[PDB]
């Protein structure tokens, strides 16, 4: 079978980004030994090791949706993957408010319509489970107390 490739964006500190960029544009397999990216079983934490120097990483959710588009003639572009995550290196904390481009900054706060979001259904399912495992349930919409 075929499994859709999973592309994400890696953000590095600027000096380490310059060393990684120089090693990528060089093209040797020396870069393969130098740059590493550990992923922890939290799923939202990691180490990226540049030249064997550990950096602390967080995998965050991006507010917009990006799409990688490949081309052979620079006139027709074929969509290859959807990017929604970034492993910035240096829950609410794992959500990034800004977008990658310069015009998109504070997009989630300002350029996004506040569609109501409810996560919340899981808590309701847990409440239903505590209900079904009980015997007698008493409920009242309340006031200030």
């Amino acid at each position: 079978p075929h499994e859709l490739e999973s592309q994400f964006i890696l953000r590095l500190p600027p000096e380490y980004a310059s060393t990684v960029r120089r090693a990528v544009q060089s093209g040797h397999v020396n870069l393969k030994d130098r740059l590493t990216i550990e992923l922890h079983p939290d799923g939202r934490h990691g180490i990226v090791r540049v030249d064997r120097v550990p950096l602390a990483s967080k995998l965050v959710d991006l507010p917009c949706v990006m799409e990688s588009l490949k081309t052979i003639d620079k006139k027709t572009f074929y969509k290859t993957a959807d990017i929604c995550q970034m492993l910035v290196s240096t829950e609410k904390k794992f959500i990034w408010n800004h977008g990658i481009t310069l015009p998109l900054k504070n997009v989630r706060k300002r350029r996004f319509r506040k569609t109501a979001k409810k996560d919340v259904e899981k808590e309701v399912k847990r409440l239903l489970s505590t209900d079904a495992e009980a015997v007698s349930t008493r409920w009242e919409i309340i006031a200030e107390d």
Partner: protein, 56 residues
Amino acid sequence: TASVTSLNSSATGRCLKIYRTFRDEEGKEYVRCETVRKPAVIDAYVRIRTTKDEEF
């Protein structure tokens, strides 16, 4: 955060409190009163009951 209108705990300004009766190991009958102050949680559970009340 960008200034936005802050909604009250629902139109009624009413929280939801649930009393649960359960039996502990050996012999016991403890009762647990749990209060939900979040409308997001309130709205879903009440809709589920009102629906299950029509199924009954």
